[PDB]
Curated annotation (Swiss-Prot):
Essential cell division protein that coordinates cell division and chromosome segregation. The N-terminus is involved in assembly of the cell-division machinery. The C-terminus functions as a DNA motor that moves dsDNA in an ATP-dependent manner towards the dif recombination site, which is located within the replication terminus region. Translocation stops specifically at Xer-dif sites, where FtsK interacts with the Xer recombinase, allowing activation of chromosome unlinking by recombination. FtsK orienting polar sequences (KOPS) guide the direction of DNA translocation. It comes from the Bacteria. Belongs to the FtsK/SpoIIIE/SftA family. Consists of an N-terminal domain, which is sufficient for the localization to the septal ring and is required for cell division, followed by a linker domain, and a C-terminal domain, which forms the translocation motor involved in chromosome segregation. The C-terminal domain can be further subdivided into alpha, beta and gamma subdomains. The alpha and beta subdomains multimerise to produce a hexameric ring, contain the nucleotide binding motif and form the DNA pump. Homohexamer. Forms a ring that surrounds DNA. It comes from Pseudomonas aeruginosa (strain ATCC 15692 / DSM 22644 / CIP 104116 / JCM 14847 / LMG 12228 / 1C / PRS 101 / PAO1). This is DNA translocase FtsK.
Length: 67
């Protein structure tokens, strides 16, 4: 269930290198379910790793280009 804010979430996670649901919630001022669905979309796209046993993920993709 795809979201218009996906690209903005990917800019945040690849700039910040944080991909927790709480970090995305705080940045975009959105709810848990909506943030969680975008992070699962990022995992399908190879932007972030699967979650570890504690739900933490690592950001794989590079930050946005500056030119």
């Amino acid at each position: 269930e795809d979201d218009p804010l996906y690209d903005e979430a990917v800019r945040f996670v690849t700039e910040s290198r944080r991909a927790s649901i709480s970090a995305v919630q705080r940045k975009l001022k959105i709810g848990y379910n909506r943030a969680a669905r975008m992070i699962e979309a990022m995992e399908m796209a190879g932007v972030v790793t699967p979650m570890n046993t504690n739900g933490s993920r690592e950001v794989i993709a590079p930050a946005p280009v500056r030119d």
